Design a protein around this ligand. Sequence first.
Ligand SMILES: [Cl-]
Ligand SMILES: [Cl-]
Ligand SMILES: [Cl-]
Length: 196
Amino acid sequence: GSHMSNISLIVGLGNPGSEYAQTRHNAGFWFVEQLADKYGITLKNDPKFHGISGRGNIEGHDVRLLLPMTYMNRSGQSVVPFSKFYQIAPEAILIAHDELDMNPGVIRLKTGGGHGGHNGLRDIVPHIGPNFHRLRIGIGHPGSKERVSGHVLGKAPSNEQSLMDGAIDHALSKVKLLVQGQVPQAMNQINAYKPA
Ligand SMILES: [Cl-]
Ligand SMILES: [Cl-]
Ligand SMILES: [Cl-]
């Protein structure tokens, strides 16, 4: 199983299909795919867990990566059985996701708390509880409740995409702290990021 708050499962939330790959609601996929490339973790088809998953070494630690292929609002139908089968406690899970309540170029590491209206997190918290870690990738304010769908399923303009990409790059540099269980120092170093 997992060991204490050494992160050993990193989930990226998003929707499958080329038509969703560049949308804001796939920010978690972007992070996890970049992380996988950084450390040479193969992301391969995982039909038993309704996902694409990988396993490999990050900085001396055995870590699994998971992209649910369920569609966003059914993400728990991948995350929950995956984490149960491998006996990964929530305290050893990091879930990367788009955050409507933060600006593009803002990124934060959070432990615990609610879904904040996120329809992927809403499918996960009921089953494993709230005590997993989150990489909240700011995607900006949607401007109204009605324009939320159009915002998260939007492809960001290049300025906003640059701001998100720089924040995600910063977070990739701090995963070494997370897999080593240095969650407080990672929180300090991630949350301090500024784009300019
Ligand atoms: Cl969705
Ligand atoms: Cl936060
Ligand atoms: Cl969160």
